[PDB]
Amino acid sequence: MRECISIHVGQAGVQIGNACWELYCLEHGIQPDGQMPSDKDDSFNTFFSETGAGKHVPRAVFVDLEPTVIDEVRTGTYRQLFHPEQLITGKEDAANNYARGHYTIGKEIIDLVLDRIRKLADQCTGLQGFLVFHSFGGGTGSGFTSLLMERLSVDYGKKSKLEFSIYPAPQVSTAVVEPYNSILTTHTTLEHSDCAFMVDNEAIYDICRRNLDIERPTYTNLNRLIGQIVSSITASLRFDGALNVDLTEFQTNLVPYPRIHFPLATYAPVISAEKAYHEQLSVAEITNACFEPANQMVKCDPRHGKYMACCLLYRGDVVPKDVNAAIATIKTKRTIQFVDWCPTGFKVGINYQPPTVVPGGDLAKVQRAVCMLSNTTAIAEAWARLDHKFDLMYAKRAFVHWYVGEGMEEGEFSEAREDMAALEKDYEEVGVDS
Amino acid sequence: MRECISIHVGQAGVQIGNACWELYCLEHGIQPDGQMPDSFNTFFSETGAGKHVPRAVFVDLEPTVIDEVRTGTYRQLFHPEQLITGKEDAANNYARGHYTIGKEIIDLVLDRIRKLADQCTGLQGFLVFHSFGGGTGSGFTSLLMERLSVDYGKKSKLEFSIYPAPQVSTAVVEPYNSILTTHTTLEHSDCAFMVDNEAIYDICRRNLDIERPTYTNLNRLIGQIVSSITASLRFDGALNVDLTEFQTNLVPYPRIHFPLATYAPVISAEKAYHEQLSVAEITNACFEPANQMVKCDPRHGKYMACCLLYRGDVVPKDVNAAIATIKTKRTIQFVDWCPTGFKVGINYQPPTVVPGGDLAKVQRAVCMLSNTTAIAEAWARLDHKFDLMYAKRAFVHWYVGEGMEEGEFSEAREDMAALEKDYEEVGVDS
Amino acid sequence: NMKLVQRALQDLQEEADKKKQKREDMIREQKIYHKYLAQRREEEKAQEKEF
Amino acid sequence: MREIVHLQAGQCGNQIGAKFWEVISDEHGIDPTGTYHGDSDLQLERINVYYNEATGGKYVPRAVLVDLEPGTMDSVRSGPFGQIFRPDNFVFGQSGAGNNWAKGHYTEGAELVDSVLDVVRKEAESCDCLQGFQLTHSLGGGTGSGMGTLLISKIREEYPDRIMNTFSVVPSPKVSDTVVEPYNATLSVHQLVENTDETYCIDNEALYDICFRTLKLTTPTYGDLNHLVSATMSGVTTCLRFPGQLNADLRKLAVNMVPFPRLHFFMPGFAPLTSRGSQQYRALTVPELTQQMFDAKNMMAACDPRHGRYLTVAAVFRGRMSMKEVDEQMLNVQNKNSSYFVEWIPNNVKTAVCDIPPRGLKMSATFIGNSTAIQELFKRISEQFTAMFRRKAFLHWYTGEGMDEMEFTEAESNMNDLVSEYQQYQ
Amino acid sequence: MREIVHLQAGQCGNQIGAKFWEVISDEHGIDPTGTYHGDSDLQLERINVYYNEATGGKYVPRAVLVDLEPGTMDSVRSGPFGQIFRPDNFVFGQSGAGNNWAKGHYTEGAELVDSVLDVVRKEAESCDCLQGFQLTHSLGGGTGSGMGTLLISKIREEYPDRIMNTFSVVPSPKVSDTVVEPYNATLSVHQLVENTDETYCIDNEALYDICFRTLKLTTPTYGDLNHLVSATMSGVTTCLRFPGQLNADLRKLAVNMVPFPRLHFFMPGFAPLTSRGSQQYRALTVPELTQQMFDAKNMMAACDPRHGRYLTVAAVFRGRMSMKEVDEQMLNVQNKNSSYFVEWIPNNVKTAVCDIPPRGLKMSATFIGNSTAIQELFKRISEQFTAMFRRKAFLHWYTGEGMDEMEFTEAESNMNDLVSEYQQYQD
Amino acid sequence: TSDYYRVSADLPGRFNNPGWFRGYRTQKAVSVYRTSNQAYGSRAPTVHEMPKVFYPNSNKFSQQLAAGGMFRNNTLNVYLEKSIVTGPDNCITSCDRLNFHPSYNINRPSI
């Protein structure tokens, strides 16, 4: 009955979805040909549908404008898993233009995307939500996601549509129109998303440099950690828990205001396989690494801000007595701080089933793990760093001739500026105490 | 639930860090791989798979000496993240190791000790080891003391010091390194022992019958002192002592926290065959200045207080029999306001002899800690030479070049000047 | 009263044996999987050299 | 003859009841299939207090299970005794509340409250004479409280003169699990004060102290805790299905212990628990049985009897004992503690004895006591509730679902006067 | 009937708890399991005086053991007689005092007095008529001197009229084993003189003197030291657990032993000691019992009776012995040593007898005696303390914890008026 | 898996043996013409990767009650007159205040 739909936007979305679906297949014991080994249970039903021949088909749509990223999926090992109408391919890419991906290029395949969305909703008997995986950097993942969220909000009333996103790093960037793309998605992630997770590239880079003992990691090693985080999110759906949560459950328990739905996600432990021979791994020892400011997976320091809400999801041999003991320990110290109008700011869930190791991965076989999702006041600095850069670029009216050309008006940048400034002032007015 | 953190600073600290932990592993029966074939829980921490990691943090600013630990015999026993290396060293400079270079890893170690102090359900106190001669052993160790003071208020921080010898020196700015750390260990050290290298040099010459010893044979001897200090925590005894016990029963004033450390008997296996050792025949050797581990004679001074640590089959009757014979000798003196200056401890298990070591298997031992006024004898020799060097304004061009103000030299000599005066006023009888 | 005493003793002994079995199982499994990891590192180095 | 209907609400309630049926079916000697395997006929005489007759020599419990999750009860039926339930009684919703008190009271509650009510009305009128209903629920969740309170108000109106026994799991500050936990518990006592006959205040943090110090379990899982809660549920209604020299059922205790209609919250405690190492060293007689009952550490709530004044005390004994040793030991406690007990109600003692002990035990007792320390819990919930509501936090998930902003204020005021009339009666 | 709850304070209190509960179980026939294996019914008639009844035919000692350091707690419970005591009675803190009186009385002892008195009051009210309490503690340690005054001062106000026994392990000039030991002794005798009915004085230098010249052991370990002091402490509470011709209780001794409430420091001694090679050369006859005892070599503390005066001495005897031979040997010591006793109290000896002897012996004797050489110990404690304080020794360990320096000078003035009041009763 | 890792015996055979898995990518010699996506799903799972103990959700077991319809009352209306006395011979209703099992009295005739 419980069923969520994955929508992977862009090349980053396709790589993230490939990692996540390989992880899900190896977790649920399903061959890449599509079917389970029939020589000997609804854990697969959370994401897979049953055909007439006994084959499993994932409930995902891989949409990207570039032709070149989808043919690798059609040629590789998992060519048999996906029905070929799920893989939606455009004709030209947006060329990192929000205007092109909103007004000209993305309006050709939107009918096909909504037809496949209608087909999967017809297959679903009652859906827990959609999960849309994207990044703020590219033109597809900005603009096509921007009107896709609007189409899903019009066609679907109150169904939960999580927006998992990759934020542009404050120092390392592979684009010049990157702030132009990123700021014009702020209206999209404000009211067309029921919840909006983001991760930062530079922080995951730092953690993969230090903790995992990898001299030269890459996008596969980042997508492994992203898939582990999303797997620890969805294990509450898929497997029985001593104390269980749901998507609606933690979105209600974490989102304090209709404008404030931007959590920060970290994972613990992220350790090396040789050091797992060295370290003790208990729940009280891994709950510290979630709130260490070094291991936070966003390049923003939570010590500058005040914590509002915390969400904790534990996997493995985890006991509520030790969980509450660790919470009682971490509440006392002054370095961890809480707002005055939220004394009991925690939400806790436990699942028996541990995370599952991957072939070719970098982590170790871990018995007790935790994923943490906090709603903080530390994102003001991380968005102010992009604010100053975007205004600095838009100072001399640079990179505007195209966006004027395809059809967005000139004042929409000022509209985005006023929305962003109002949202930062909402952060300030929340951050003031009494 | 007793447990203590070892901290070691510098090339002296890492070499004494390995030698102390080589004694610890054979004492508790641990193979180099980290697994056995509740005594160890004081200095180790059990894994779910059963591996025991030494619970120490090694700090150094040269990669040349840590790497031998990462390559040697015990390369799998020590945790990879515990031995912390700098990128460039101060090279016998206090100011470089204090204000400019040491701050790069002041944030790394204060996160690494937190991972081990969060494991401290109840912590007796830290042990820190350093050497005054080196740059990191003077500079970074100085800024190590304020952060451990601010973070933890009243936690115990014992220290073994390596104070420069009066005649043989490994450096020229070594007195400059030693004097500028006097103010730091004045107010930020709870207890502070001192041991000098040349005082150990004569001991291995005439007691252990070794023609040419090296720093390995010196490192084994200092590890025997720290073993008998911590033996009461790990091993039960007739009278168990604590780190909080001999801190109170030896230190009369907050400004005076500088004992002297001795060990007896320290004899060869050739001299273990002939000489019968009894309780009285080994406690008298801690009184002789020839066996003293600091180049100063307590005959010129007066015994302030005495702490005794006994190891092995030591009868409490023989403890009190020797003390009466000790007190009758007028070659030793006590002050008029400490009429009962003795504090004793008893442990049943004899210490462990190491293969490749030099001392023999012995059943009885003493590790006597006596505060004296004769430290002012050895302090005056260094304080003469610091002003003698500073008279012609030498080597300070580097220290000013690091940024630190010239007046910190003038306040450090005067802080040491009235410290000697305070040590002199106590010695006056009523 | 003897019924109560004997039942309490047998439950305590059963719990102790279960915990000992868990610890031994953990030891063996960790040893095996570390040996497998060493073999896999040798394999990847061989492939890199061949390329 | 005197019939009790069992209700279970939410995921908390299902785990409370699943261990409870395992306790008493084994007490009556009932196999997991459902047949009777007993040694004495005194077990067989009274089974119809909770059980309903079936064919083939089988008995089925008179229970329903209420939870707003579609797949939550598959864990219940997969248990060792899970198949004993009639499959015609399982009632559940389609979309979860999300720990929202509004969802279980306004949005998702209306479609399901009718389907539950005709089930419980069908199996109530078939019985001989309905003594009361029994409900287990939690005050920290949306389904356990919101669907629970929506049922309770309709039970009172449809059955005006009956007994309605509830079990309330009050949220605790140090074992707090939910961000919107004070919002649920403040509006739940509002419906729990005005249409409820009886209510016990079991608290999660007090369950942990029993395991921490008295019972000394290394791994206090939720299964072991529900064994302790069901033992309090077993001891209070042991006179209804077993003969006793001095009988006392639920109707007698509710009359005597409730002097005013807004005072129906009590604090339980249990006595025989010991560690298995110290079991052989403990003396199991009558005077040491009440020694551990009075202990402030052994209380099942988050309040201190030394701070408070006892209103009325009751001890339901389970085992074979004489009457004067029960009388003289209980009287001495009232006389020796001359300060805590109230002065205008002399001889606060309620006594209840049944001859049949539980299996694996010869002496036991259970505690119920009305205390003036109950204002400690309610005021502590009050100050956390008014912290959230002052800056208007977490309201759009409740305001947009159907209520106004003024229901919290009247619920706070109906909680403000509740602790005040506890203050003047103290 | 009459029940006394045992109290133990400090590490020294633990091994004397282990040794005393061993010997009292041997004389009443208790196995390490806990049950009864005896051959005479007289051992079973009076058992609740120190044991606590429990289900299963077993008896748990009615004792409380207080310590601030958990190191020796495992050594007590892992001994040969370590599985008899109920685990709830073992109570310990998490941070030790460390041979400091100040830690155990102001800062760290305050958080544990609530928990230990919760244990004490629960088992105190179980008895019908509790006869009193019995404490053994060391002044040489921080917990025995710091907490030991805090428990005793609180129980006096909680139970205003009850018998209390204390055993005080005082420092020694020769066998001094702590520098700050005079600071511990001075700040507690003021508490020990206002809030104590009965006490004994035990010093470790006295026990070494007994084992040297009388017992002839080359190595007197603390196990043999605890053997002697337990036999003294078992020897006074005999009429509680066995009847006799003339039975006398701790209240019956005390009313005939204390003339003024500040005069409670009493001196014990034990008759049976000898050697195995001289065992055949010794005759157990009641003149020999009063001969071997009255020698000043067998005193149990740091005193000498030739420098002082006997106010009153108490007699407790063991063995089926005739009353006239008890009577005549006690009149002759009053006739002969005419200068030692006081003049204004005639008949300065009170006597008690018991029928059965302890195991392995047929006759024995024990005295409790009030001497004025106890102030010689008080002058020796005072003189090292008063000299130490002019140079302001270790005051940062004391003043900085909350107290003032005026608490020391009132303790000095109280003990100086104690020894002055002691001196006036001498002449 | 059972050769090395002992199991809870509720796992399926697909987790007891990885040899049933065959659709995974086999290993060839590496070459110059390689795609960085071929890291994902590169290799079949060995024995040290499948979890020991598996806990499903069996949702059809509740779906079979969910899909039929929820239990309801549609004119199953009966009411039984019941009495407070224990005896089967006597049925005293609150409305009918009359004693049953009439007394066989020797002296007075017919009540």
Ligand SMILES: Nc1nc2c(ncn2[C@@H]2O[C@H](COP(=O)(O)OP(=O)(O)OP(=O)(O)O)[C@@H](O)[C@H]2O)c(=O)[nH]1
């Ligand atoms: N964290 C993370 N970010 C990625 C990854 N791949 C791409 N990105 C981000 O994607 C941004 C650029 O977008 P693209 O990778 O080109 O994909 P796109 O969003 O569809 O843009 P177009 O290909 O031009 O349509 C860069 O700024 C990267 O930060 C990835 O594997 N992990």
Ligand SMILES: Nc1nc2c(ncn2[C@@H]2O[C@H](COP(=O)(O)OP(=O)(O)OP(=O)(O)O)[C@@H](O)[C@H]2O)c(=O)[nH]1
């Ligand atoms: N007692 C003792 N002292 C030693 C030993 N080895 C080195 N030292 C001391 O170490 C000092 C020299 O500094 P090091 O410790 O070697 O080096 P460092 O602490 O890293 O400081 P830098 O050389 O400036 O980096 C000398 O003054 C010696 O007193 C040893 O084996 N035993």
Ligand SMILES: Nc1nc2c(ncn2[C@@H]2O[C@H](COP(=O)(O)OP(=O)(O)O)[C@@H](O)[C@H]2O)c(=O)[nH]1
């Ligand atoms: N005593 C007890 N309390 C529990 C147990 N499980 C959960 N709880 C409490 O119930 C609260 C959550 O209630 P929830 O399960 O969401 O109620 P529901 O929405 O009706 O299913 C938590 O705050 C826990 O403290 C249990 O097994 N025993």
Ligand SMILES: Nc1nc2c(ncn2[C@@H]2O[C@H](COP(=O)(O)OP(=O)(O)O)[C@@H](O)[C@H]2O)c(=O)[nH]1
């Ligand atoms: N008579 C006697 N004295 C003892 C015994 N054990 C220790 N002592 C003395 O007590 C002192 C140590 O006491 P300590 O352990 O510090 O007491 P605590 O601090 O209260 O636990 C030593 O100086 C010993 O001389 C014993 O068994 N008998």
Ligand SMILES: [Mg+2]
């Ligand atoms: Mg692309």
Ligand SMILES: [Mg+2]
């Ligand atoms: Mg260095």
